[PDB]
Design a protein around this ligand. Structure first.
Ligand SMILES: CCCCCCCCCCCO[C@@H]1O[C@H](CO)[C@@H](O[C@H]2O[C@H](CO)[C@@H](O)[C@H](O)[C@H]2O)[C@H](O)[C@H]1O
Ligand SMILES: CCCCCCCCCCCO[C@@H]1O[C@H](CO)[C@@H](O[C@H]2O[C@H](CO)[C@@H](O)[C@H](O)[C@H]2O)[C@H](O)[C@H]1O
Ligand SMILES: CCCCCCCCCCCO[C@@H]1O[C@H](CO)[C@@H](O[C@H]2O[C@H](CO)[C@@H](O)[C@H](O)[C@H]2O)[C@H](O)[C@H]1O
Ligand SMILES: CCCCCCCCCCCO[C@@H]1O[C@H](CO)[C@@H](O[C@H]2O[C@H](CO)[C@@H](O)[C@H](O)[C@H]2O)[C@H](O)[C@H]1O
Ligand SMILES: CCCCCCCCCCCO[C@@H]1O[C@H](CO)[C@@H](O[C@H]2O[C@H](CO)[C@@H](O)[C@H](O)[C@H]2O)[C@H](O)[C@H]1O
Ligand SMILES: Nc1ncnc2c1ncn2[C@@H]1O[C@H](COP(=O)(O)OP(=O)(O)OP(=O)(O)O)[C@@H](O)[C@H]1O
Ligand SMILES: Nc1ncnc2c1ncn2[C@@H]1O[C@H](COP(=O)(O)OP(=O)(O)OP(=O)(O)O)[C@@H](O)[C@H]1O
Ligand SMILES: [Mg+2]
Ligand SMILES: [Mg+2]
Ligand SMILES: [Mg+2]
Lengths: 316, 321
């Protein structure tokens, strides 16, 4: 009874350590190094010590493995010690069963489940102690890091794991087979620039602002297009977009410059995700692209970006 | 004596502890291309490996429960054996000893050994670990219902994966950096875009501009040049009955001897409850920009153009935490 009281606290304390190391492992190895260096530049409390741990992901796995294993071993080495003193030789089992059922719930699975909901907030909190324990285990680290001269875990939620849950959607009907492809496209659609999908000026059909109104229809009805850029004595110099509908319903005296409208000029590095929205806000369809020198380069239509997101994807 | 019963279970548990740890690494380290090759080659333990990898979470919970249970058993028998010899100094002798044995033989050891022998070991352990996996089905059932977690969700217990659940996953992706902040707002947008139907983004019949198929082109151009549109439906003796669609780009480029019925083209009729995520792909595949919505009785109720759906997709997009 005397020592038993002192043993149930080490049992509880070791359980918290095992949970602390197990939950710390999930949050730490899940933050994208691209995002860690973002929090560090912002200077948030914990990012510096977190970028340190990311410098050697092998240090995050060994620390949490050893700190937890040591704890887990102590969590049960005492649970049976307490068990036997309470239940004789039947305590090695009783103490064993009541230990394995708590190392699983509060020292392994529970701590891992909790850390997934709060992964950025917890990673910044356990950056200091985990980096501290890693220093204490520098002997054991060098032992396992030195063998690296004699010949990585992934986050709880990977972009592939998400993609897979969507495929489950298509399979179960909750998600149309058409928007699975669109959901797949969005993920491969934010880092895309307009230059990657623009129509090179070479293949563009345009018209000079000095041309004849009637002569413009010769282009529309011959090329079948509905919107052609307009240029001013230089293919480089785009001064307006001409809409075919305006020419069909044109007055008897109007000229090319009367029915053209100011184009939305954009760079070659324009993200097409925000351009599909900027065009949808102007009620406009075409966007003129300019290179680094302001010279014409190509055009981009809402029909281009639409083709991107609607493109059909492969099923795994 | 009872000691002999303890030291034997101590080793056996230490082998299980190392069997699961090394089976987890080997089963997960192996690439999807290697399994597909072993699948076609048809080697022993491949078919059971292909299924075992379908849910990478089911592999970690079984190898964890296994390695954890065994590890505790290794420690239990050390604190017990040592206690039988060293009284209460055994709890320390057991803890300290077990703490090093599990680490070097149940954890770190089995892990490093698996990284170099991923192929051979995965096949020899795909069968036993898969067997255990089916025993853990009760645990896999509960885990797949706790939707506040994202660590152990096997998805092999037939869960209801609805738009709600995917959003939960995407929210986590943005928080850890695997998904960018901006490309999450897009997923939430298209996620709710699929819920929208045709009627909710259509133009009601009352606002539509049509032209009777018995009119003349001189009248057709007048409509376009007045309403500004580029396409208008066509009917026959009744407003409920739509028979085609007319485009100005063709009426302007119409032969001297032309008509409205020969210039119009068959429309794509759709119900009011039509999903626009499908219609957007279908309209984009038929090269057409406008559909025709028909109410339950197959009468003209409105139209849905590509632009009508892009507004719902873009300007009215969702985002939440
Ligand atoms: C809920 C579960 C709870 C289980 C138990 C959790 C135990 C947490 C472990 C506490 C470790 O405490 C840790 O000690 C070290 C040494 O001071 C601190 O690190 C310190 O080290 C450097 C120098 O080495 C000091 O200059 C500086 O004050 C501090 O960074 C660290 O900030 C703290 O985090
Ligand atoms: C589960 C049991 C695991 C084993 C227990 C741990 C045993 C640790 C034995 C290794 C001693 O650990 C470590 O050895 C190296 C020797 O090069 C020491 O480092 C020394 O060599 C390295 C280069 O290799 C130098 O960078 C460093 O400045 C020097 O101090 C280090 O100070 C010591 O901390
Ligand atoms: C120390 C390392 C410990 C290694 C022993 C692990 C336990 C042995 O694992 C054992 O493997 C065999 C296949 O190889 C499994 O066989 C299983 O697969 C077939 C599948 O058609 C089932 O029909 C069969 O009923 C089942 O026993 C068995 O269920 C499992 O109990
Ligand atoms: C850690 C501590 C562990 C605690 C608990 C251990 C094994 C018990 C459940 O066993 C499991 O039962 C369900 C049905 O009941 C089976 O399901 C199977 O048949 C049922 C039909 O009723 C269907 O759901 C489905 O076709 C199939 O999955 C499954 O194949 C089996 O694997
Ligand atoms: C931290 C994780 C802790 C995990 C704790 C594990 C608890 C195990 C005991 C609970 C087992 O839970 C029980 O398992 C069976 C599958 O075998 C479930 O499924 C069974 O019943 C449902 C209906 O409710 C049926 O649809 C299904 O076909 C059948 O297999 C059952 O609904 C659930 O009531
Ligand atoms: N004047 C143009 N010159 C060269 N290419 C063009 C021109 N206009 C559009 N395109 C190209 O056609 C592709 C599809 O664009 P889009 O379908 O919107 O033309 P459109 O048939 O006139 O459209 P709409 O009929 O809706 O007005 C674009 O990728 C673009 O590169
Ligand atoms: N005949 C029509 N009657 C009523 N609404 C129409 C008609 N045609 C199009 N609309 C509506 O106008 C809006 C925009 O559609 P849309 O952009 O396709 O027409 P458009 O601008 O004349 O064609 P385009 O832009 O390709 O030249 C949509 O809400 C659509 O429902
Ligand atoms: Mg077009
Ligand atoms: Mg082990
Ligand atoms: Mg329009």
């Amino acid at each position: 009874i005397d020592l038993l009281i002192v043993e149930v606290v080490l049992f509880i304390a070791a359980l918290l350590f095992s949970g602390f190391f197990s939950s710390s492992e999930v949050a730490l190895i899940s933050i994208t190094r691209a995002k860690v260096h973002a929090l560090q530049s912002q200077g948030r409390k914990g990012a510096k010590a977190l970028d340190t741990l990311k410098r050697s992901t092998d240090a995050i796995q060994i620390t949490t493995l050893i700190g937890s294993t040591i704890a887990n071993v102590a969590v049960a080495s005492l649970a049976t010690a307490i068990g036997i003193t309470l239940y004789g030789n039947l305590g090695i089992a009783v103490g064993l069963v009541v230990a394995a059922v708590l190392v699983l719930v509060f020292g392994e699975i529970g701590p891992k489940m909790y850390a997934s909901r709060y992964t950025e907030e917890l990673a910044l909190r356990v950056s200091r102690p985990i980096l501290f324990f890693s220093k204490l285990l520098y002997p054991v680290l060098w032992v396992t890091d030195r063998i690296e001269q004699q010949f990585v875990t992934e986050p709880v939620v990977t972009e592939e794991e998400i993609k897979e849950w969507i495929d489950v959607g298509e399979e179960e009907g909750t998600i149309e087979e058409e928007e699975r492809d669109m959901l797949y496209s969005v993920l491969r659609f934010g880092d895309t620039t307009a230059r990657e999908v623009m129509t090179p000026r070479v293949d563009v059909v345009m018209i000079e602002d000095t041309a004849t109104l009637e002569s413009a229809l010769a282009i529309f009805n011959e090329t079948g297009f509905s919107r052609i850029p307009v240029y001013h004595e230089r293919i480089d110099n785009i001064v307006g977009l001409l809409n075919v509908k305006d020419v069909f319903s044109a007055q008897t005296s109007a000229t090319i410059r009367d029915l053209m409208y100011e184009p939305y000029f954009i760079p070659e590095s324009k993200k097409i995700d925000e351009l599909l929205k900027e065009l949808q806000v102007k009620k406009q369809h075409m966007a003129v692209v300019l290179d680094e020198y302001g010279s014409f380069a190509g055009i981009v239509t809402v029909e281009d970006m639409l083709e991107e997101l609607v493109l059909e994807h492969h099923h795994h």
